[PDB]
Amino acid sequence: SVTASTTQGQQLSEEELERLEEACDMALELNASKHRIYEYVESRMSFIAPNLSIIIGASTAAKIMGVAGGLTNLSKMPACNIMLLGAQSVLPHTGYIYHSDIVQSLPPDLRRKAARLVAAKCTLAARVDSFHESTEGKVGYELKDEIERKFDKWQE
RNA sequence: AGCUUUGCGCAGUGGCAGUAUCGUAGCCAAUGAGGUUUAUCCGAGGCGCGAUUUGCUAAUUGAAAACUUCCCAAUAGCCGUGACGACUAGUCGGCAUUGGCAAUUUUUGACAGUCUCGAGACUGG
Structure with a gap:
């Protein structure tokens, strides 16, 4: 309001205002579509791979399940490859679980x-939900408590 | 029967020893430590804290450097002299101590160097 009192800006057209209006409307369409995709992918990924979704986050869980080629290919990968899963001058030897929110929740x-x-324990979680045990996700909860327990152990 | 591999133990030669060797009871660690190289790859301990027995010998200071001393008195050659003694003023033997013992015959150095085949020669300017 303070800088709208002194804008130094000229008014738009009607075509310019309606062009910006439909641009903002399709931007909200993209935002609501993104959040709809997020809700669906978290629901279906908590059904498909519950423990991996609990550890990493279900969107990154779906990304590393997809680029590896499913759960039954994600299990028989080691921990040193699921770290570099989703890799490619920005950071080297980084995968989809380096740019996760739980791996960026800490100093650089x-x-x-x-x-x-996070690559090792989720690998265990991946193996744990390659077979269909721990459907409620207790292995994911226990391992995620272990993850952020070690994170708080390193932090001050 | 011989050869031989790996791990461990013992001893020995040699080498190394404070960017070395360990302890860790605190935590983490193959359910993955730690990764800038080659990363759909590698794979072992890591971070902190804390350390780096015993016998022998030398040397120094110190009065004393840790295994059951100093001090006084006396005892442990010959020419003269004094007595005692012996033998005829003289001689001899032993004892004793109240002066002396580097000037040719002795005990305060004619010795030292050299040369020749047990024996001699040369020099000491």
Whole structure:
């Protein structure tokens, strides 16, 4: 309001205002579509791979389940490849679980090691939901408590 | 029967030893430590804290450097002299101590160097 009192800006057209209006309307369409996709992918990924979704987050769980080629290919991958799963001058030897929110929830030098912590345990989680045990996700909850317990252990 | 591999133990030669060798009871660690190289790859301990027995010998200071001393008194050659003694003023033997013992015959150095085949020669300017 303070800088709308002094804008130094000229008015738009009617075509310019309606062009910006439909641009903002399709932008809200893209935002609501993104959140609809997010809700569906978290629901169906908590059904398909509950423990991996609990550890990493179900969108990144779906990304590393897809680029590996499903759960039954994600299990028989080691922990040192699921770290680099989704890789490609921005950061090297990084996968989809380096740019996760739970691996960016810490200082920038605390990052790489944390990737190896989230890659290993979720690999266990991936193996745990390659067979259909722990459908409620208790292995994911226990391992995720272990993850952020180690994160709080490293932090001050 | 011989050869031989791997791990461990013992001893020995040699090498290394504070960017070395360990402890860790605190935490983490193959359910993955730690990764800038080659990363759909590698794979072992890591971070902190804390350390780096025993016998022998030398040397120094110190009065004393840790295994059951100093001090006084006396005892442990010959020419003269004094007595005692012996033998005829003289001689001899032993004992004793109240002066002396580097000037040719002795005990305060004619010795030292050299040369020749047990024996001699040369020099000491």
